[model samples]
Every structure is written in C-alpha cells, then in structure tokens.
Target: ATRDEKITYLRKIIGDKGSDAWDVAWQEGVTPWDQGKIQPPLRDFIESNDGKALVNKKSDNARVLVPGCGKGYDAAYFASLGYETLGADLSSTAIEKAKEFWAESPELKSGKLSFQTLDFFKFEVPEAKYDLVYDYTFFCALPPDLRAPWGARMRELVRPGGTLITLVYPIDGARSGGPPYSIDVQKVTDALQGSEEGSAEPGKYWTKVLDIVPQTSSPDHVGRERLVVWERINK
Candidate 1:
C-alpha cells in the first residue's frame, strides 16, 4: 500500500492523524513500549561483539541507523560506543522527547548522535549506506501486513557489506492488538527470505543467528525472542 493509504488504514484502527508513531504514543501515553533504558540483548551485542562486527570504533565515524527509535536510548547507547548514530521515529512527540533527552543527557550528548522526525513507510533509504541498522521492538510494533516492506527497506538502507541486526519477538498476543505485539518465526523468515521477501530478490539473504540471550530473557520470551544478524548482499 502507498504511505497515505497505510496511514489512512492505520488511522481507522489507531484513530489519529498518524504524523508518526510518537504522536500517538505521546498523545495517548500508550508508549509502554519505551523501556526507559537500552534493551539487554542489544547491550550484550555491543559489549560482546566488541569492534569486530561494527564498522567504526572511533566516535564521529561509524554510521548507524535505528529505525522506529522511540525515545532512542538504544541509539544513544550505540553512540556512546563510538558509533555515529541516527535515530528515526514516526512520532514528532517521541522524536522531540528523544532530541530533548539526547541533547541534555551526559552520556548521550557525548556521542555523535541525531534524531530525525520521519515515518518508516514513506521515508527514503539512502543508497548503500550505514554500517549497521539496529532493530529492536521496531519490527513487531507495526502491523503484520507491512513486514515485507520493512525487510525491503532494511535491504535498501544498509550498505552492501553492512550488517542488519534485529531482535524478534513472537506473535502470540496479536489478536488483542499491539505496540508490544507478536510475530511468528516464519513471518520473520518470509519477510527476510527469498525473492518476494529478502533483499537478494531471488534467494535467501545471508544471515546468522549470532546468539541467543538465555539468561536475561524472561520465560515468556525464552523461545520467542531471537537475536539475529544478516548481511545485505551487494546488488
């Protein structure tokens, strides 16, 4: 669907002007999705991966994109590690809060980071860019229908040798609706596999499981949440 059409359809379900995810979240205070801190899995990735997987070790150099970055603590965390980060969010309110927090934050202010007010569906992906694209709760937050587009956009946004890192949660409670929604492994696979879904257009995308967080993860999320890494093939 076109961006306007997606928003129009979403407006009926979410009932708002759909400026971005943050507007609704800020307006309604339905942003429980905000962890108020960096997710543990992501924290582990940064600490464990060291400098091997990432592009830049020094600050003001590496480019990282965090999509659907509400409040942006995760993005800020990445910046603290010397990765230049750009966080994008659909919510003006969310973006505003993130900007305010980052600008004033001691940890975040030190890192070269910026936040942009934009929507995921319509935003243009830069060509063969970014060392890494971080995906946390951003994937499951959207409606199930847009999963394919999400994967496509990821392929478009990342540089040829760039890495796509994501945390996937299960699709158990989707019937009730969600910001903390659910997703099956298959859906995620379809979204990132073969011609119609993955970036390669004709085959599966090159990816690895990386590792799983067994200790910190809660029981409910045990088999559900997966820490995954994929490489976008140079087209």
Candidate 2:
C-alpha cells in the first residue's frame, strides 16, 4: 500500500480500536509520524528568545514530559539539554526503539532521557507535576471527542508556573481524515483556554505566552503548523 494510505488505515484502526492498536503499528513499522529527528520547530523555539529563557532558567531542576514521543527525538533533545525528560508512548516497541536509538547516540548515551510505554491520559508522575509538558502530535492523533479530557489532563499534570508547549499541526483548512489529523490554531486555543462560564469545560488556566507561525518545518509541513506556548496560571 502507499505510505499515506497505510498511515490513514492504521490511524483509523487506532481511532476505532483505541490505544491498543498502536502496538500493532509499531510492530509493523508503520509510524510515518516518527520524523526520526528533532522536530525543526522545537529546535527553533528553544534557540529563540521565546524558548531560550523558559528552558534555560530552570534547566537544572526541570522535568519534561513528551507525550507520544515516537522514537525519542524530542525527548532526547530535551534530555540532552539537561532536563529530566521522559518519553511516553503506548507501544512498548516504540519505547524500546527510543531506548535503542539513544544507546547508539554518540553524545546522549548517558543523558537523563528515559522512555516508558503507557497511555498518555492515564500516565502519572511521582512528583506532583512536570515543569514542561510538550504534547505535539498526540493531541491531533486523538479523536476530537477526547479533547476535553485531554485539556483536563494537561491542567492536572502541569504544575503552576510550568509551561505547556504544543506544536499544533496541519493547520490546513480542509479538516478531514487523519492520524496526523488536520488541526488549526483555534482548536488548540479552545482546548487550553479554560471556560469559567457554567459551560462545564476546563480551559483558560493557561496564559498563552507565544504563538507564531514557525520559521521552519519539513517541506510538506511549511505553512501548516503553529508553535504555541502556554504558561500555567497559578491556581
């Protein structure tokens, strides 16, 4: 099958069959979402003023969680920067692959990077929360129906004063069909912004720190992604 068709089919399976189906995709080596390198926008954000201070100020004591960290590129990037970074995925093979990738890395063979196989919604940290929680492809990969729970989970998992950086992707207006689902900047804002009205949705605790069209993306992704940063309000 064509690469795009294969990805859509696996995503549909995961969409209908739930997280367990992820293991099969990993087993079959079907993760096109794994870019195999640090996402360019993430690198740009960290090196830019918007991210430089946020990452460096607390580098010595920071803890980060990279949800759906396919092969650990981002997680390893965070760890190599001195944060205690954890890469979490539902597929054990994914985690194992991440570990193996790090093992062969020339510089990060001994970094504080770690990997775990777990459900993002259910995963917990022993420490009350993380200093930085980076959720990239994970959000769009979920069915839209789960977005509310996703927001609440973010609220509960990130400590006050911490930051949540989301790489909102596929801002393509024709929103339909995806494992890498089509997501626009506003959908992300709606999820992170708390609704204090009697609407019964949990958003708005985050103060958006930065929102910009990234300077770099993989060729196909240019103009299709936005890098948004949010700081958790003291609650």
Candidate 3:
C-alpha cells in the first residue's frame, strides 16, 4: 500500500491509531510520553566516552536528524551543541508547537535548528545524509509491521560511519493495546542486525558501539529505558 493507503487503513481498522492518531493526540493533549525536557541520559551522553567520540570524529558542523521529534527538545539540544539539526515529525500540531517553543527559546538567533512535518519513511535530502540520527520513543510509536521499514529508513538517512542513537523505551515486553506498543532491546537489535544470514538489508548491518540501561530517568520512565548506539557500516 502507498503511504496514504497505509495511513487510511490504520485509521479504518483502529479509529485513533497510526500516523494521524498522534496528530489527534497532540490536538487533544493526550501525550503522556512527553518528558518536557532533553532526556537526561542523552544530555549526559556528552560526558560519556562514546558520545564525546562521536562529535570529535566529525566536524563541528556535522548534521543530525531527529525523527518523531516531539516538541523538538533533543534536536534543539543538538543544535545548541553546534550540529546542524533538523527535527521532523509526522504531525502538523507537533511541528507547529515545536517551532513555537524554539522561537521562545534563548536561541534568539537560532540558525542550526529547523522543524518540519514529514513522513520519516518518505523523507529525503538530495545527496546528503545525516552524521547522527537520534531516536527516542519513536520506534515503539510504530506498529509491529513498521519496524523493518524503520530500520531501513535509519540506514538510508545516516551516512556511512555515522551514529544511530536509539533510546529504546518500555522494554518490558508487554503485548497489549498501546500507542507505545510492546518492545524490548532484542527487537531493535534484530531490526538493525539482521537475524537471517545473507540478507539484503544494509540497515540490518550496523556495528553496535554502545549499550546501557540509563541510571536516571523521569518518574514514569525510571528503569524502563535502555540506551543503544550503532554506527552504520558498509557491507
């Protein structure tokens, strides 16, 4: 199915599900997943060996992309640190609010940050790819069927030797009705590191660089989120 068809089908089968449900969630203020600040682990990653190496390995002006960037906190943080950053969201409401928040922020001369309403699966940027792609809670937001595509898109967006920081959340493995549907570390690992031998997935061929369970989190996410980092490797 085309993107529109897939969206329509999801809405038809589950009234408030799929890409559009998030927009409604924004409109209705039903977003409970928002932490309202840069996730602590991400903020402190700069102090960690792995995170510091990422920037030192690249130019100070290296580009980063944050998809499913709700309210744009992480993207803004990256931009503040001197990376050219773009925060993309599926919902118009999210982009609107994200832009407003950035405008109100202290970066009165904000130049490195931008927010766009975009479909992650369908997005492209001419011949350039990102040096880093950060995803927090964006994976679990997808239905089970979309997991593989998510991996593929990540590979496409991030350049060779670039980093992919996937902050996996709700790692309890519970399968039930949820927007933050059930997930665990293995699911994302397999999605990136193909389970099948001789597979054609370039996305599934990444070098796992860092993995850790965060020591700090918001009240609700404590002990629930795990930080995993991967670097795309040429096959």
Candidate 4:
C-alpha cells in the first residue's frame, strides 16, 4: 500500500490518532517501515570509525534505548555487541513478537536484552537515564503536533553528556501529513537543543556532535535519510 493508503487503513482500524493505531498496524502486519534489518548507518556506526569514537570501552556498562522499536532488530544488534539494551514499543503485539523472536537468542538468554510494552510518553522512563537513545524512524513516525513533546521526552530519557543518534527519514518533501510525515531535520535538532520555538521550554541545549548523510540500504529509505548525532551538553 502507498503511505497514504497505509495511514488510511490504520486510521480506519484504530480511530485515526494515538499509539493504538500503530498497534493495529502491527496486528495486521502492515508495517512497511520494518525493513527486516538494522539501519545501515547504525550498522556502520557500530562497526567502524564512529563506533570507536562513541562506544565506550566496556559495552556492558553502556545502556541503549530504542523507543518505538517495532521489531527490535536494532535493539537486538546492540544487545549482540554486549550493550545493555532495552527496546520499548507501544504495541503489545509488537513487543510480544520481539520477545518471541529473541527469546532463544544468546543475548536474551544472557540477560543483556529486554523488551517492554509501554507508551514512550506515559511510561515511567528509566530514572537512571540511557547512555544512548536511538531514533531511526520514530521521529518521522510521529505527528508534527507531537514534535515538542517528543523532544521533551527524549531529553528526559538521555542523560547529560549522553548521546542521541537519529536517522532523519522521509526527507523527500514538505512537512505536511501522514504517519511518515516530512521533517525539516533542523526542527529535530532544535527540539533536542530545547531551542525548538514551540517546545515546552528551552531546556539545556544539545550539541550537534556529528552529522553525516549516508546512502541507505533499505529500499524504502534509500537516498532519503541523514544520520545526525547530538550530545546533551548541560547538566
């Protein structure tokens, strides 16, 4: 289905707006966004130069969170590298499938990976904060109206000096509509920096630590994504 068709189908199933709409999408297996592999930029980030610059010496000490983690492939990849990884999804069906898929994996068996069924905004986020929070499709997946709140929640989840990595997606057109909403890209950085004009309040600004535009391997995302890295700079 086209993005519009998918959105229309989801809205019809679950009332147009809210997390449950995604749940229904998952229930029906209509997630065209699930590319069945970890994002290429992320895979390269972990396996090459940037990994050396960002990943700590002891991976076990590092905690990573992947919110709106549909199938948890990225989370699974992180766990495989021995990072303590948590993947959360609003859809219980997705979380169930994630757990089922990973249950027999060595990482889950070793207790290095976990999955939770919870809304990112409503749940009590980790008080200790995460070392790294990843955003692949999550940001673009949200409605524009939630951009500021999304920024606030991200700030709350990532610790000061911790990193936020995002693959800005669907950079194909104007910011207007759909679950795959178009983004200005700068808005995301501004939101994270707390300088987003419509945000809750300008909190501690986040510094753009790294930015790269890499070709994508996923057919749907190819040539339309940019990898951006930001570090929370204020305590």
Q: Tell me the number of clashing residue pairs for each predicted model.
A: 6, 4, 0, 0
Candidate 3 off by > 4 Å: 1-17, 106-108, 194-204
| lDDT per residue (tens digit) for residues 106-128 in model 3 | 44256668899998989776467
Question: Which candidate has the top score in lDDT?
Answer: 2
Q: Please list the C-alpha lDDT of all candidates, in the order they appear.
A: 0.68, 0.82, 0.78, 0.79
Worst 10 residues of 1 by lDDT: 50-59
Better of 1 and 4 by TM-score: 4
Backbone steric clashes in candidate 3, count: 0
Predicted structure 4, TM vs. truth: 0.89
Q: Which candidate, 2 or 3, would have the higher lDDT against the true structure? A: 2
- What does candidate 4's lDDT look like per residue over 1-235, in tens digits? 6966876676565445466688778888888677776888788877667776677554457898999998899899888877899999999999998988777778877778889998888888777789888987888888777888899899889888888888888887765666677875677966676554565554456877677776445666676778888888778
Name the runs in model 2 displaced over 4 angstroms. Answer: 105-111, 199-203
What is the RMSD, in Å, between candidate 4 and the native fold over all Cα? 2.8
TM-score for all models, in order of appearance: 0.78, 0.91, 0.86, 0.89
lDDT value, residue 22 of candidate 3: 79
Give the lowest summed-lDDT range of ten residues in model 3.
Answer: 5-14
**RMSD for each of the candidates:** 6.0, 2.3, 5.7, 2.8
Local distance difference test, candidate 4: 0.79
Could you give candidate 1's per-residue lDDT for residues 1-235 as a string of tens digits? Answer: 4544543454454645433544764765555555687767677666665434453443355588998888998788777766778889887888888988778756466547878888776777665378788888888877666788887777677776677787777547444555446775556667766365334444455455454643455555676677777777645
Better of 1 and 3 by lDDT: 3
